[PDB]
């Protein structure tokens, strides 16, 4: 069990701040 | 002095059988240091137990930590629940 290097969770600062939640603005066919 | 270290880790083995009480990601989150338990958030800033006036070896076993934490009295809470409806 002592040979089980763990996985870092990286935050990536621009993802942490202001990410919103393109065809659904109908101007582009 | 850096800021953007990871400081949380996840082990690959899914041990999610007896773990519904811990903090899950949605696995188990494993941090790089322990937690910090804080008794009461609000300091009671007067109270000569803490203020220490300069006038006049003694011990005192106070009931709980709730003396030092600004709790409201129950008559106001009943008055406000009467004002509720």
């Amino acid at each position: 069990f002592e040979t089980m290097v763990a996985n870092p969770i990286k935050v990536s600062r621009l993802q942490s701040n202001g990410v919103l939640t393109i065809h659904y603005s109908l101007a582009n066919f | 002095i850096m800021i953007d270290a990871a400081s949380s880790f996840v082990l690959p083995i899914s041990i999610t059988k007896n773990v519904d009480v811990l903090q899950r990601t949605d696995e188990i989150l494993w941090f790089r240091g322990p937690s910090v338990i804080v008794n009461e958030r609000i300091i009671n800033s007067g109270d000569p137990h803490l203020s220490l006036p300069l006038n006049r070896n003694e011990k005192e076993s106070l009931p709980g930590p709730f003396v030092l934490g600004l709790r409201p009295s129950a008559k106001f809470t009943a008055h406000r629940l009467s004002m509720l409806r």
Binding site: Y24, S25, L26, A27, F29 | -
Partner: protein, 83 residues
């Protein structure tokens, strides 16, 4: 942004050769068009009507063509086979 341009679609010849629309020019809810039903101000809702994504998918872009005391009316017939 997010506004449709006012022109540039002239899907008329495909409805001439649709074979469902009864146009005699060529040979070779439950409504169909939302002219009585609001769509709550999303244009994307008009893509649920089956004759209207027909005019966005099969459409093209057109360029605009640019240009006596008693009338005598004469009827003119036109009958030409072509390909």
């Amino acid at each position: 942004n997010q506004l449709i341009p006012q022109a540039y679609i002239s899907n008329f010849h495909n409805r001439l050769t649709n074979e469902d629309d009864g146009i005699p020019i060529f040979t070779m809810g439950n409504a169909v068009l939302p002219d009585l039903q609001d769509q709550h101000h999303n244009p994307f809702n008009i893509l649920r009507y089956p004759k209207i994504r027909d005019t966005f998918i099969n459409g093209k872009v057109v360029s605009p063509y640019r240009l006596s005391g008693e009338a005598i009316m004469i009827p003119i017939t036109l009958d030409i086979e072509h390909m």
